[PDB]
Design an enzyme around this catalytic site. Structure first.
Site, short mmCIF file in Angstrom:
data_model
loop_
_atom_site.label_atom_id
_atom_site.label_comp_id
_atom_site.label_asym_id
_atom_site.label_seq_id
_atom_site.Cartn_x
_atom_site.Cartn_y
_atom_site.Cartn_z
N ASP B 92 0.96 -1.15 -0.10
CA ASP B 92 -0.20 0.03 -0.07
C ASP B 92 0.89 1.19 -0.03
OD1 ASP B 92 -1.97 1.74 -0.09
OD2 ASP B 92 -2.90 0.89 1.63
N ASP B 255 -7.92 -7.49 0.63
CA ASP B 255 -6.83 -7.83 1.82
C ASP B 255 -7.53 -7.31 3.08
OD1 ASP B 255 -6.61 -4.77 1.09
OD2 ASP B 255 -5.74 -4.89 3.08
N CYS B 293 -12.62 -28.15 7.12
CA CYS B 293 -11.36 -27.39 6.79
C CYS B 293 -10.16 -28.35 6.69
CB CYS B 293 -11.11 -26.40 8.20
SG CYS B 293 -9.52 -25.36 7.72
N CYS B 295 -7.03 -27.37 6.61
CA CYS B 295 -5.74 -27.00 6.76
C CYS B 295 -4.89 -27.81 8.09
CB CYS B 295 -5.77 -25.35 7.55
SG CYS B 295 -6.07 -25.36 9.32
N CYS B 298 -6.35 -28.04 11.59
CA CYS B 298 -7.81 -28.88 11.70
C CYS B 298 -7.42 -30.26 11.68
CB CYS B 298 -8.61 -28.29 10.89
SG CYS B 298 -9.52 -26.70 11.27
N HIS B 324 -5.12 -21.27 10.62
CA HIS B 324 -6.40 -21.95 10.41
C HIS B 324 -7.19 -20.68 9.75
CE1 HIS B 324 -10.29 -23.12 10.25
NE2 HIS B 324 -10.84 -22.09 11.00
N1 LIG Z 1 -4.45 3.62 0.32
C1 LIG Z 1 -5.51 3.20 0.61
N2 LIG Z 1 -5.40 2.17 1.56
C2 LIG Z 1 -6.71 1.49 2.09
N3 LIG Z 1 -6.91 0.52 2.64
C3 LIG Z 1 -8.20 0.65 3.03
N4 LIG Z 1 -8.83 1.68 2.13
C4 LIG Z 1 -7.77 2.22 1.66
C5 LIG Z 1 -7.75 3.61 0.71
O1 LIG Z 1 -8.76 3.91 0.41
N5 LIG Z 1 -6.60 3.95 0.35
ZN LIG Z 2 -8.39 -25.21 9.78
#
Ligand SMILES: Nc1nc2[nH]cnc2c(=O)[nH]1
Ligand SMILES: [Zn+2]
Ligand SMILES: Nc1nc2[nH]cnc2c(=O)[nH]1
Ligand SMILES: [Zn+2]
EC number: 2.4.2.29
Lengths: 358, 358
Positions: B92, B255, B293, B295, B298, B324
């Site tokens: 990021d 994420d 699961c 993994c 488990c 897990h």
């Molecule tokens: N850079 C950035 N990271 C995020 N992570 C969650 N939302 C955002 C976003 O709007 N911009």
């Molecule tokens: Zn598991």
């Protein structure tokens, strides 16, 4: 598979190397036992503990009896099952940890977070322990009274174990020698232990702050007091140099929280001595923790990364440091075993020393 | 190996499944990216992160730039090398974490623990990031000014990246759409992003507390605004049900710290919903975390043991819960991928929902 068979394959002076065969596995001696306090060797999966070369781990009777409870663990299938370690486990009796960690009597010890020899053996029975320790207690007049009560408790421990057939046929029982630093009391205790008869003999009362010079002096007369043909276990020891010196005086087994605890705190063992990974000198050091170590951490990660991890309080820092330190300890024991078998232990210890303290 | 090649293998409604091919590996889409905050996915070795099926992880520009420093990491061989993950990494830009975690201007943001689009791209360059995020910023009048500055910064981000040949040829650059919950601004932003041209398009500004009903409503008009032929990334989302609903609206990448953070806190995801392993109801439960699961946790350990671990604050508790939960998330994405490829995603989502909320 035998219940308990100790065979000495080779000797050098007072040092011995060999094996203990048990139903759940073979133990190579001199052996180091990682400590698995609350049903876990801290920050390691049992498969990892095995990968480092450990043959047996130590579990604590005092801690497990409070959390999660021995009957609960039995109900859950036993300690092996519960934590997923299928090899031997030695459980301490609770003795040491009840004093230092929390109403005494001939009956036993009553405490605050009613443990007696009988209850201690029963809890270890419930956990499904492979090596059961007899229940024991922490000035000359006083040393003898503590030592004398413990020998009484060892007899109680013996009979309680023998009264449980399932235990007698599948587990082993170790006696613990006390007596403080006095040769006479030490002698008394071995005589009483030997007359009761045990599968192994520990030297208790030396993980106490006395210092190495004095510990070694006590081991100097104490270990020859014990039956030669049984394994000799030094409880709660120690640093790599403590271990080497103790093997030179006849000890076959060791446990210590040092490699695990120290690792979480930033201290890594190397053949050139311990380092504190948090020191700024490692911030850009690309070398492994130790440049001879065969463990998975030293194959993959730099001092610099582990420095970063531990300073940031990251869980992976503790995992890596601990895996390395236990691996180091196992590699030390392997070097000890191989050198005694080859008749060059005395030289190994001297070389070890020169480099480690250097 | 291509620098960045996104191929859609199948579709169902707005959902897509396919692959992103990169120099360091293939990314299966819809993809979930474990978050590796300070150069570590908390409590997991990278080999374990891989074992769970992750194809790519997320690293934070804001955090690494402070500890251990981007130039230091470059000197050390780059983030891949440093943490031992040799697959794609998305970093990021620092945008989000500089606001919420610590002096704004057209130039950039100045702060206390002088980040600009140019410096952001340079730091990501230094870390050796595979997917670089453009540098961006956090009422209608105000939404447009934030959104409008970000689009200016995205153009700055574009040129800074393109000015670094080593980056241009081996990495990819993603644009981030802002605009709050307004369709008009959202539109504006996509138009500006599309006119600049990026390898991928994120939807920013929805990991904010708005709730799922409103997030979905915004995704409903927002994602069709983005170039169809490029991957669509929803930043910071989310719960399993957020993920399913977002895929139904066209998102290819995700994420979230939820599976890791939650795991350390005692929360385990199951196909019947999240459980809190610390609850006393699990103290003697021998079943795995989830009974479907696949993994490694488990396969090996009981709820009861992990209950014990987490109540005792043991490191292994966090390790097991986290492994897990990340495995669960990857299994969810695999189920999503397979069902879209088979043309039965709509039914999968309905079935998923019925069981998970039940
Ligand atoms: N850079 C950035 N990271 C995020 N992570 C969650 N939302 C955002 C976003 O709007 N911009
Ligand atoms: Zn598991
Ligand atoms: N039971 C017991 N445990 C120990 N651990 C370290 N020293 C001792 C001891 O003397 N007795
Ligand atoms: Zn090592």
């Amino acid at each position: 598979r035998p219940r308990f068979s100790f065979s000495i394959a080779a000797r050098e002076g007072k040092a011995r190397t060999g094996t203990i065969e048990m139903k759940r596995g073979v133990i190579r001696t001199p052996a180091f036992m990682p400590v698995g306090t609350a049903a876990t060797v801290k920050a390691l999966k049992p498969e990892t503990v095995r990968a480092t070369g450990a043959d047996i781990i130590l579990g604590n009777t005092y801690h497990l009896m409070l959390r999660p409870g021995a009957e609960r663990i039995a109900k859950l299938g036993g300690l092996h099952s519960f934590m997923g370690w299928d090899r031997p486990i030695l459980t301490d009796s609770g003795g040491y940890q009840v004093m230092s960690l929390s109403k005494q009597s001939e009956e036993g010890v009553t405490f605050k977070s009613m443990l007696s020899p009988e209850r201690s053996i029963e809890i270890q029975h419930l956990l499904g322990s492979d090596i059961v320790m007899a229940f024991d207690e922490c000035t000359p007049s006083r040393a003898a009274s503590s030592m004398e009560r413990s020998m009484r408790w060892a007899k109680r421990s013996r009979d309680a174990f023998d009264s449980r057939k399932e235990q007698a046929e599948n587990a082993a029982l170790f006696g613990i020698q006390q007596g403080s630093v006095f040769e006479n009391l030490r002698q008394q205790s071995a005589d009483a232990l030997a007359e009761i008869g045990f599968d192994g003999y520990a030297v208790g009362g030396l993980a106490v702050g006395e210092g190495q010079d004095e510990m070694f002096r006590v081991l100097d007369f104490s270990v020859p007091m014990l039956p030669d043909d049984k394994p000799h276990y030094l409880m709660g020891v120690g640093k790599p140099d403590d271990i080497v010196g103790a093997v030179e005086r006849g000890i076959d087994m060791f446990d210590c929280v040092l490699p695990t605890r120290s690792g979480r705190n930033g201290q890594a063992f190397t053949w050139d001595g311990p380092i504190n990974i948090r020191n700024a000198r490692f911030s850009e050091d690309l070398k492994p923790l130790d440049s001879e170590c065969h463990c998975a951490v030293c194959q993959k990660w730099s001092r610099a990364y582990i420095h970063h991890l531990i300073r940031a309080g990251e869980i992976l820092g503790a995992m890596l440091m601990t895996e390395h330190n236990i691996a180091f300890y196992q590699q030390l024991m392997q070097k000890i075993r191989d050198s005694i078998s080859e008749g060059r232990f005395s030289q190994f210890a001297q070389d070890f020393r020169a480099r480690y303290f250097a």
